[PDB]
Amino acid sequence: KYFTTNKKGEIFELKAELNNEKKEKRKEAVKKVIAAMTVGKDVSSLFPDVVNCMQTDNLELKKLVYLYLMNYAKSQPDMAIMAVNSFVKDCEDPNPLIRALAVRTMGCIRVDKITEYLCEPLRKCLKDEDPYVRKTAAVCVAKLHDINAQMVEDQGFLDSLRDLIADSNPMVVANAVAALSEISESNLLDLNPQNINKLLTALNECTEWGQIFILDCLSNYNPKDDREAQSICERVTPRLSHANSAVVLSAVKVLMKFLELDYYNMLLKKLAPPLVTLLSGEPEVQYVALRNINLIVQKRPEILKQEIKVFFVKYNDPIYVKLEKLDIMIRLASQANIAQVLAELKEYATEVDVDFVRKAVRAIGRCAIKVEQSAERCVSTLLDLIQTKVNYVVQEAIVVIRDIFRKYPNKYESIIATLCENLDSLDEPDARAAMIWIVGEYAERIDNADELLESFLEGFHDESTQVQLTLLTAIVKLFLKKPSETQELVQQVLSLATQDSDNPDLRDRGYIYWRLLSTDPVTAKEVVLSEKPLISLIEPTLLDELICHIGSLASVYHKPPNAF
Amino acid sequence: ESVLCVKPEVHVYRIPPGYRASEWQLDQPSWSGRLRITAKGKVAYIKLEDRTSGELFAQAPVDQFPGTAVESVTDSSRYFVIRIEDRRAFIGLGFGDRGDAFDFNVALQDHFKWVKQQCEFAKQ
Amino acid sequence: MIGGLFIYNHKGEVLISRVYRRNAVDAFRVNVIHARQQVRSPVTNIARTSFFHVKRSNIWLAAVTKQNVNAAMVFEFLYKMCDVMAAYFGKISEENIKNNFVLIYELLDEILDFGYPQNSETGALKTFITQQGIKSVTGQIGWRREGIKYRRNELFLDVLESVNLLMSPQGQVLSAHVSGRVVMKSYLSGMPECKFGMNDKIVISIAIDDCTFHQCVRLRSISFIPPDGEFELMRYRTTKDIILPFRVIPLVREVGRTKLKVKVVIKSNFKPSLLAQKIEVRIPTPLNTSGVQVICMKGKAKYKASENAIVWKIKRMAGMKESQISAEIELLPKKWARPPISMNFEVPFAPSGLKVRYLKVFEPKLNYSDHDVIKWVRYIGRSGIYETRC
Amino acid sequence: MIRFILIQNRAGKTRLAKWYMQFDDDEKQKLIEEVHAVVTVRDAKHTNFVEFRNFKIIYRRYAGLYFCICVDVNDNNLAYLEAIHNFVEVLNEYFHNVCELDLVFNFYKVYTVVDEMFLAGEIRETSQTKVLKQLLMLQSL
Amino acid sequence: MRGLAVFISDIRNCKSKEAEIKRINKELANIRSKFKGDKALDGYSKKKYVCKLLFIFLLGHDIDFGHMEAVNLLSSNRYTEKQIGYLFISVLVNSNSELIRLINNAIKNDLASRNPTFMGLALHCIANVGSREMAEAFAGEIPKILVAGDTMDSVKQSAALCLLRLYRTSPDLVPMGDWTSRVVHLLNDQHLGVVTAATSLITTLAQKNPEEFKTSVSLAVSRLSRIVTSLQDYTYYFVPAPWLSVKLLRLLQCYPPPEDPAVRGRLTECLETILNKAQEPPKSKKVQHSNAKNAVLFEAISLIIHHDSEPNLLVRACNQLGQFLQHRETNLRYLALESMCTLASSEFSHEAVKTHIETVINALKTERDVSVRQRAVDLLYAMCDRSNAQQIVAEMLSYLETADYSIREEIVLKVAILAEKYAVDYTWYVDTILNLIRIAGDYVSEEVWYRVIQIVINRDDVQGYAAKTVFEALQAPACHENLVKVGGYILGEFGNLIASSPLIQFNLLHSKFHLCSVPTRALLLSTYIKFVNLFPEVKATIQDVLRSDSQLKNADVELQQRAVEYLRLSTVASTDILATVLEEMPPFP
C-alpha cells in the first residue's frame, strides 16, 4: 500500500528513538507515542518495541509504557496479552508503586487468559505490607469479577476481601467495601458485633470517598431491633458536616432509612441544617441536592417546614435549579409563609427568562389551589402582573386566573373587566382558550358576550383546535343563557364546526351540540350548564422505593432503578 | 448567620482624604484577600479575611447601604470606601472585575431589600 | 459506577477518553452538546445510559455511566478532577489539555481505579504522579449623560435574528448560520449597571462563528452600562446546532419534458405554543412554463409569471403542523437546472438557540431595584437566504 | 471544477491545502475544520462522495492521510476519485515510497506536483509518465 | 536546502503550542533582520529564507513582509529560485499596487522567455493568483501563447487552463476572436494532454458561447472514437485515457445531438462501445480499475440521458444500471441510484426502468449506509405509476416496520402521497393508511388522519374493515399515539360492526386512556358516550369511569367540560334523547 512504508516517516524516527540506549531519549520517545495514540495514529507497529523499554529500573519509564499498555488493555485486548510475561515480573519487584501498576493494568485486560497469570499475583498483593498495593489489589478483585470469571478461586478471593474490611489503613477499607458492594450484584456478612462496629470505626477515619461507599453499604443494612438503630445513627450524624457534596447525601441515605424508630423527633432537627447547607455548593451539586430534598419534603414534610427562605431563586442560578427551587418552594408554601412566597413569586414574574417567568406565574396558581386562605393574595398578585402589561405575562396570567375561577367560583368574578382590557394582546392558543371560557362561563353577567365571541369567529379557522372546541362550547353556553340574542351565532359556529371543519373531533362536538339544542333546550341546560365540580406528588409505593435510593441517580430522575 | 456572597481577590487601599479614585495610591494594596458578606439578622457585616487561613482582617457593620458605611467612589464602578468599626475608621476596598463589584452591590442591596420587607410584614 | 471520562472540546471532538466497561461517545455528542431545543439538565439518561457532565471553560467533562451511581459523588468527583487538573495546568482549556495528554492519563489511573474515585488529595498525588504539567479606572462614562430621570424604568430587550439555510433535498443540513443581534431600548434612569446573562450558545461566502459587542460591554456574564435608549448591544453569527424552524420537502417528479409535478411539504420544527407569521414559499418553475395548476388547501398561492416562481403565501402556521402544495406544471419543449426553493418567514423565538437568562440592573445613588424595572424580551427570528435545494 | 485540494492528517494538521477559490484567511481555516469533521468520521463502507456545504468532497483514506478534493456538484465524482489515486502514485514514484513526513520536509515540492497535475481548478495532466518525465527534468534544473 | 529541515524538525519536536510560537517568532525576527538589515544575500540563501516564511505561513501564522524579497527571486536565472518565488506570491496573495506591477514586470520577463520551464511556471503564477490586475494585462497575450505553434506542447496545457482561470474570474475581459478557431483545432493534437486542457477550455467557454464552438462536436466525437475503439502513455490500469474520455464526453453535454448524421453515426457507436465494455469481464481486479472504467461509463450514461435521442441506448444504459445496484462497492450503488433518478423521468426509459423494481427494493432493505438508502426511496417515488403503485407502497410499509429512526420521516410522507395520488379504490387507501398509522403513526400528520376517517364515514364497506383494523392495531401494548385518536374515533362510530365484545373494546381504550395527551384523552371521552348509545350493557362500566375524580375534577378545562356533559347525557333520565343526540353522523361534504 501507500503511506506506511515501514522504513521512514514518523514511525522509523520513533523506532530509532525507542531503540536508543540512553534512557533520556527513551522517556521522550514514549511520550510522543502516547500523544500519537489519542489523535488516532496507527502505532500498533511500535508495540513490540515499547515493551522492550520495560526492562529498566527507572520509575518514570515504566509508567509511560503502562499508559501505552493501558490504552491497549481496553481498546484492543488481544494485543495487550503479548506483554503479560513482563507484568508478573513487575508484581515481585520493590518500589511497590510498580506492584500496584502491574495489578491495575492486568485487571483491565478483558481476555480470559490472564486468569492463570493474575490469580497468583493478586494473592501476594492482598497480603502486601505497603497498603497502596492493597488499595488496588482489592479493586482488581472487582476487576477480575467483571472478566467472565465465575471463578470459585475468586470465591477464595472474597475470603480475603472480608478480611480486608478489618484492616488498619482506612484507604484499603475504602475500596474493599466498594468492591464488596459492587460484586454483591452477583455476601457482605453484616455481623452486628464485629463488621458494623469495624465499618463505623473505619468511617470516622476514611477518605472523603470511602465514607461514601460505607454509607452506600449501610443503606443495605437491616437492624435487629430499634435499640441498635439508635446506636448506628449516633455515629453517622457526625458525617453530616464534611466538605463534600456526596458524603452528606449518603449520610442522609442511612438516616432516612434508619428512621424505623423521642430520638425520632431529635434527629429531624439535626437532618435539617446540612440539607439546607447542601445548597451552598456548585450548580450541578444543587440539582442533585434539590431533587433529594424534593423527596424528603414529600416523604417527611416536617423536616424542612420552616426553611423556605433558603430555597428562594437567585438571578444567577442556572435553569435546572431555578425550575427546581421553584418546585420545592411550592411544596413548602403554607398559611404562615405565603406572604413571603407571593411577594417572591411576583419578583420572578418581572424577569426576562421566558420559560422561567412562564413557570413562576403558574407557581402562583399552585399556591392558590394549595393554600386556600391566600387566593385573595394570589389574585391581587396576578391583577398586578397584568398591570405590567408584559405580553408573555398577561398571556400566562390569563390561564392561571382561569384556574382560580374554577377552583373558587363566583368570588373573584369582578376582575374579568380588568382582564379583558388586554383582549387584543392575546395571541397564544392557550391564552385565547382561557379567555373564551371566561366569556363563555359568566356570560350571564358580561353584557356584550354576544360580540366578544363573534370577534373570535371571523378567524375561526387558522386556530388551534383547543381554541376551536372551546369557542364551540362557549357560544352554546352563551345560547343556553341567552336564547334570544345570540341565536344568530349558533347558526354560525355550528355550521363552522360541522359544515366547514375537517377535524372530526371538532365535527362530532358540533353535531352533538346541534342535536341537543334542536331537541330539548330544557334538558340542554342540565347537560351543558350543570354546576361543574371543583378542581385540584410521587405515589407512595414509588416514593418509599426512592428513599432507599436518596443519594443515588435513581432519585435524581424520580424513577425506580429498574428503568436503568 | 447567613453568607450573602463570598469572593476572593479584593484589595484594600488607604485613603488620603468626594473620595475620587485616582487620589489613592492604586499601585500596591495595603491588604489583599477574600471578601465575606455575613448577615446577623438586620446588621450586615462585610468581612475582609485572608485567602489562605481565614484570618479576619477588618469588619464593618453597614445598616444603611445608601448610608455612609458603604460609599461607592464617584469615579468608577468598582472601587469603594468602607467605614470599619473596631472605633470608626475609613479604609478603601477595590475590586478586580466589575462583576465582583456588581455582585457586592446586589448582595448588600438584597439584604436591605429583605430588612425593609420584613419591616412591612411586621406592620401587617 | 463511573463507566468512563470523556473530556470533550467545543466542537464535540474527543480530546481524552477512558472507558471502564463506543456508542456512548457520540450519544453524548449528538444529544447533549449539539442538543437543539432541550433545556439542559446536567445529568440525562439517553437510551439506557446516564450522562453526567460538568463544563469548565469551554470543556465538556462527560462521565458516562450505566448503573445506579451515587449522583452526588460523580458530580463531586468531576469537580475534584478539575481541582487536581487546575493545580497542574492552571486554567482548564482546549490548549492546556492538548499540551498535557500524558499527564491526564496518569491522573485518570490514579484518581480513579475501575470507576471508583480514589484518594484525589493533591498533596498525596505528587508522590504518585511523575509527569509534570505544561503551563502557559473609568473616569467618565462617555456614552450616557448625567441626570436621566424617566418616570418609569424599562428595558425593551428584543433579540433580532436572521436565519440562513441551504438544505439538501435529502434533509441533510448543508449550510446553516444565524446572523443575529441583540437590541435593547434602555429607558433606565440614573446611571445603571446591567449584568446581562445568557446561555452558552455563543462563542465569545463562509460564515465564521463570531460575536462582537458594543463599546459599553465589558468582558460568562456580560456587564455594562446601557446608553440612552436604543443601541445594538451584541452582534453575532453562529454556525453550530441551529434550531431550524421549517423543513421543506421538495418532491419533484418530472414526466418527460411536457409536464412537471411539484409537491412541496413544509414541516414546522418548533413547539405549537409558538406561531410563525408571514410565511412565503417561492417554488421556482422552468423558464419555458406555459401554465400552472396550483392546488393547495392551506394558504394562498399563485403563479407569478414575471418571476417564474410559484409564490405560496400562507399567513400563519403554528408549530408541529404541516402543509402541502401540488402544482402540475405544464411545459413547452437542455434539461432544467433546479434553483432552490426559498422560504420567507418570521418566528417568535431565536433560531440560533440564544435565550436570555437574567438581566439585573443596579443603580448606586438614587436607588431603584430590578423589580422596579419592567423588563420586556421579544425574540424575533427571521429568514434570510433560507433555501432548500430542489 | 476542483475548488480545493486538501491533504490532511487524521489529527487535522494539513499537509497540502491548495485553494482554487478566493476565500479569506479565516474562511480557509474553517472549511479545513469542516472537512475533517466529516472525513474522519465515516469509514470504508461509506461512499467517498460527501455532499459538503454547497459542493462535493471526494476523499480517499490513505493509511492515516485523507486526500480530499472538493468539487462542484455537477462534475463526475468517480473520475475525480481516481484523480486522487492518480495523484498519489505520482507522489509515490517521485518520493520513492512516500511517507507522511515527506509532505512536511518537502512541502514546496508538493506544490509543484499539484500545479503539474491540477491547474486552475482542473486536471491538467493525466499521465504518470509524462509528469515524471517532466518532473524529473525540473529536479536537475 | 538543508537549512529548512533543521527548522521544521525544531518546530515539530516542540513540547507545546506555546513553544512553537516562541520559536516561530524567533525565526521571524531572524528573517526580518536579514532582509531589512540588507547584507547581500547570495541567491540560494534568500531562497531558504523565503521558504521558511512560506512554511510559517502554512502553520497558520501571519506573514506581513518578504513580498518585496520574493519579487527579487523572480528575476533569477535558476529554476529553483523561481519556484519558491512564484509560490510565495501565489500563496500569500497581497493587495499592494507597488508589488503587482513588480510581479507583472517579472512575469512578462518569463513569458517573453522561450523556456518551457519558465513559461510553464509563469502560467501557474497567473492561474493561481488570478486577480483582475493580472487579468487585465494578460488577457491578450496568453491566447497568443496558446495558439502559436512554436510553443512547447507542455505549455499549451497550462495556457489553456490559465485562460480558463482568466475567464472564470474576468469573463468580460477575454473576448472571443481569432482565438476561437485554433482552440477547436487543438482536438487534433498529437498529445492527449493538450486535448485534456483543450476540452477543459471548450467545455466552459461553450456554456455562454455555444454556437462559436459548434465545430468542436465533429472533432470531439472523432477524437473520442480513437480512444474508446483503440495509448501506452495514458492508459490508467488498462483503461485508455479516463479523464480525457470524461472531459471529452462532457464537452458533448453542452450541445444538442450533432447536426451531421455522420457524427451521430459516430457518436452512438462510440457510446455503444463504452456500454459494451461495461459488460465485458474485467481486465484487472483492482478497485482503481473498476472506477476508471465506470467513470467513463457514468458520463456515457449521462450523455445519453442528456440527449434523449435514441431509445436503444437508454434501454441498455438502464439495463446497465441494473447490475450496479447489486454491487459490492458502495460508490457504484450510490451512483447508479443517482443516475436512475434522472433516467426514470424521461419518456424513453420510463418503461424500461420499471422492470428493475425488485432490485431497488432489495437494495433498499440491505444497505447499511443511509445516504445510499435515501436515493433508493427517491427512486421508488420516481418509478411509481399506477401499474406498480400497490407494489411499492406495500413494500415501503413492510420496510417501515424495521426501519431506522433516520429515514422514517421521509417514507411516511411519501407513502401517504403515493396512496392518495394512486388510489385504485377507497378500500385499498384505508388499508394502507391504517397500517401507516400502525407502523409509523408518530410521523403521520393530522392532515392524513382526516382523509382516513372521512372515507370511513362516507363509504359503507370500509366501515367493517376499518373497525377490525384499528382494533387489531390497538391491541399492541406500545401502539403509536395517533392511532389511539384514529382508533378511538372509528371504534366509537363503528364499534357495533365488530361485536371482540363491547367489554373488550372499552377496556382496550381505557387501557390506552392514560399515558396520553390532552386531545387523545379528550377524543376518547367522546368515544365513551358513543358506546352508551350503541352498547346498552357496557353503560354501567363506563359511568364508573366518568364519575371518577380523575375525569370530572381534571385540571384542563376541555376534559372537565367533556366528562361532565357525557356524564349527564347518560344519567339524566333520558333514552330517547341519547339515541337522538348520538345518531350516526352524516357524511362529509
Numbering used by the authors:
A (entry chain B): 5 to 190, 195 to 269, 275 to 549, 554 to 581
B (entry chain N): 7 to 23, 29 to 97, 101 to 138
C (entry chain M): 1 to 21, 26 to 140, 155 to 222, 240 to 254, 261 to 374, 379 to 435
D (entry chain S): 1 to 141
E (entry chain A): 10 to 239, 244 to 512, 517 to 606
Q: What did the paper state?
A:
To visualize NECAP bound to an activated, phosphorylated AP2 complex, we determined a ~ 3.5 Å structure of phosphorylated AP2 (mu E302K) bound to full-length NECAP2 in the presence of an anionic polymer (DNA). In contrast to other AP2 (mu E302K) complexes incubated with DNA,, AP2 was not open, but was in a closed, inactive conformation. As in our previous phosphoAP2-NECAP structure, NECAPPHear was bound to the mu subunit, coordinating pT156. However, in this new structure we observed additional density contacting the beta subunit. Comparing isosurface threshold levels of the unsharpened, refined map clearly shows that this density is contiguous and extends from the C-terminus of NECAPPHear, suggesting it represents NECAPEx. Because we cannot assign a definitive sequence register to the NECAPEx density in this structure, we model the most ordered region as a poly-alanine peptide. We believe this structure may represent a post-open, inactive conformation of the AP2 complex, corresponding to phospho-AP2 simultaneously bound by NECAP and partially engaged with the membrane via the PIP2 pocket on the alpha subunit. We refer to this structure as ‘clamped’ phosphoAP2-NECAP. The region with the greatest structural changes is the alpha-beta interface, with several helices in the C-terminus of alpha shifting ~1–3 Å. Importantly, only the PIP2 binding site on the alpha N-terminus is solvent-exposed in the clamped conformation, so the structural consequences of membrane engagement are fundamentally different in the open (several exposed membrane binding sites) versus the closed (a single membrane binding site) conformations.
Clathrin-Mediated Endocytosis (CME) enables cells to dynamically regulate the composition of the plasma membrane and mediate uptake of transmembrane cargo, such as ligand-bound receptors. This process is orchestrated by the clathrin Adaptor Protein two complex (AP2), which interacts with much of the endocytic machinery and functions during the earliest stages of CME. NECAP is a coat-associated protein that binds to the alpha appendage and beta linker regions of AP2 to facilitate endocytic accessory protein recruitment to sites of endocytosis. NECAP is a ~ 29 kDa, soluble protein composed of three domains: an N-terminal Pleckstrin Homology with ear-like function (NECAPPHear), a central Extended region of conservation (NECAPEx), and a C-terminal domain with low conservation (NECAPTail). Here, we determined cryo-EM structures of NECAP-AP2 complexes which show that NECAP clamps AP2 complexes into the closed, inactive conformation.
